[PDB]
Amino acid sequence: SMNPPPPETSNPNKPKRQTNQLQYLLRVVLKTLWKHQFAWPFQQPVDAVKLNLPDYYKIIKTPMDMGTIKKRLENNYYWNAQECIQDFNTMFTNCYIYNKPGDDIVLMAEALEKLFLQKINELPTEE
Ligand SMILES: Cc1cnc(Nc2ccc(N3CCN(C)CC3)c(F)c2)nc1Nc1cccc(NS(=O)(=O)C(C)(C)C)c1
């Protein structure tokens, strides 16, 4: 089962703006998570062909990954921090939906999510 096209990272029809919270999401949240030892499965779209997971995109219909999020942030795709936080949450939820408790990938997601939430807990006051 073939890979779908990746999620968009630009869209001229979508409104957007720069906010101090979005800057933090790139400079602090994304850039820190990227360096975590367990980041790598989440740095690009899942390659379900290479992994021989032909049902991955049968089950995950709203895929999301940190490579996509990074590009969206660099490309000023978002209107607000909540939109970006939603993409991270989609990424984590997708992992917990597809995999079994106790799977290595779930342990990895959980560690990354712990760090994410620590960073979001310090999200600066808006504007
Ligand atoms: C984000 C995520 C969510 N859920 C999974 N699940 C999952 C399930 C089963 C297996 N394996 C596959 C091989 N097979 C023999 C045994 C079962 C499995 F490997 C993973 N995996 C995720 N990410 C990931 C993990 C590893 C490797 C890459 N590599 S990649 O090519 O996609 C890359 C380098 C482009 C990120 C991604």
Nearest CA among 37, 22, 32, 39 for reference residue 95: 39
Residues in the chain: 127
What's the number of domains the chain is made of?
1
**74 belongs to a structural domain:** yes
- The tokens describing 90, both together, are 């989609």
**38 belongs to a structural domain:** yes
Q: What's the gap in Å between 35 CA and the centre of ligand 1?
A: 19
Count of C-beta atoms within a 10 Å radius of residue 88: 23
**39 belongs to a structural domain:** yes
**36 belongs to a structural domain:** yes
Strand (E) or helix (H) holding 104: helix 104-121
Check if 90 has its Cβ closer than 6 Å to any atom of ligand 1: no
What resolution in angstroms does the PDB record give? 1.5
**76 belongs to a structural domain:** yes
CA 87 to chain CA mean position, Å: 5
Check if 61 has its Cβ closer than 6 Å to any atom of ligand 1: no
Q: What's the gap in Å between 78 CA and the centre of ligand 1?
A: 28
- The tokens describing 3, both together, are 């890979």
Which residues neighbour 108 within 8 Å (Cβ) at sequence distance 6 or greater?
A: 38, 41, 42
Task: Name the region of 52 (left: φ>0; alpha: ψ -120 to 50; beta: rest).
Answer: left
Question: Tell me, what CATH number does 38's domain have?
Answer: 1.20.920.10
Q: State which residues form the domain around 67.
A: 19-123
Best residue among 51, 60, 106 to mutate for probing ligand 1's pocket (most ligand atoms within 8 Å of CB) is: 51
Strand (E) or helix (H) holding 75: none
Contact 46, 56 (CB under 8 A): yes
Q: Of all protein residues, whose CA lies closest to atom 29 belonging to ligand 1?
A: 41
